[PDB]
Design a protein around this ligand. Structure first.
Ligand SMILES: O=c1ccn([C@@H]2O[C@H](COP(=O)(O)OP(=O)(O)O)[C@@H](O)[C@H]2O)c(=O)[nH]1
Ligand SMILES: [Mn+2]
Length: 281
């Protein structure tokens, strides 16, 4: 049950003026595409706080990648879901190398020990699904799954929360589908033909409700097992599988490249009013 919002004073939305005229802000299946200017964060914060929303954030830090945790976590403290309950899940082979980062109230961190970089990247699907299945259901409302070699530079908040979301890969948001680096071999479960595809989503940032995230990760894990048995490895590993899944199961929001940017590689185009979550060289 959802109680009433309180009285709020904010600018009237005007029907005959778009928030953004330079970009697509809704998909053909009526999922919002989240850009700066499309949302009033005060309204969204109220809606989600009134539900006492808890957001889980998963991150893998294996071998040398433990080096990225300090900046990742400190910047998440400044920019990720501030004001809401947050549970970080750090999956690592070196629990003792996890930095002691100071957390704000209502925020906690669990270190989960786990066991080729391609396999490290791909295997995230198995651990998120069939090993941590029960824990997440009991502890959080939404799961957000991200790469660790990143930093937050601006607000990433409840505007992203929805049953299932993907993020536009920063190298492909302006590309034709034939240029998308989908798996193109019919022998792979990740196969997408040249005449299919909505977007190219990045493997580095997806999420949704616990239920939908566990469905996605279970499906990708199973698909990857089939490929392994058939002696084939998708061109972009779990990102390829993620793309196949989100083609056949449309996300309920799509995040713009504000949410996964690489300034060194791609600069700062006019279309991006904010760079929120960015690659660390
Ligand atoms: O040795 C490794 C290789 C990969 N990863 C994890 O897998 C993610 C994806 O790999 P990577 O960031 O190297 O992919 P890229 O961003 O270069 O495409 C990383 O963010 C880590 O979370 C890791 O922890 N240790
Ligand atoms: Mn990465």
């Amino acid at each position: 049950f959802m109680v009433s919002l309180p009285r709020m004073v904010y600018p009237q939305p005007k029907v005959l003026t778009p928030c953004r005229k330079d970009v697509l802000v809704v998909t053909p299946w009526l999922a919002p595409i989240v850009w700066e200017g499309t949302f009033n964060i005060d309204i969204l914060n109220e809606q989600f706080r009134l539900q006492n929303t808890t957001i889980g954030l998963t991150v893998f830090a294996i071998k040398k990648y433990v080096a990225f945790l300090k900046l990742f976590l400190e910047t998440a403290e400044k920019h990720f879901m501030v004001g809401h309950r947050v549970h970080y899940y750090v999956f690592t082979d070196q629990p003792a190398a996890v930095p002691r980062v100071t957390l704000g109230t209502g925020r906690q961190l669990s270190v989960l020990e786990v066991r080729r970089w391609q396999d490290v990247s791909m295997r995230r699907m198995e651990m998120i699904s069939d090993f941590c299945e029960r824990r997440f259901l009991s502890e959080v409302d939404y799961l957000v799954c991200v790469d660790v070699d990143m930093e937050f530079r601006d607000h990433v908040g409840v505007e992203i929360l929805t049953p299932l979301f993907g993020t536009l890969h920063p190298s492909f948001y302006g590309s034709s589908r034939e240029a998308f680096t989908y798996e193109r071999r019919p022998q792979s479960q990740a196969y997408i033909p040249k005449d299919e595809g909505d977007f190219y989503y990045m493997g580095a940032f997806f999420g949704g409700s616990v239920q939908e995230v566990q469905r996605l990760t279970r499906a990708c894990h199973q698909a990857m097992m089939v490929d392994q048995a058939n002696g084939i490895e998708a061109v972009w590993h779990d990102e390829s599988h993620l793309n196949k899944y989100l083609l056949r199961h449309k996300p309920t929001k799509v995040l713009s490249p504000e949410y996964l940017w690489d300034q060194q590689l791609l600069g700062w185009p006019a279309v991006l009013r904010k760079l929120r979550f960015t690659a660390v060289p």
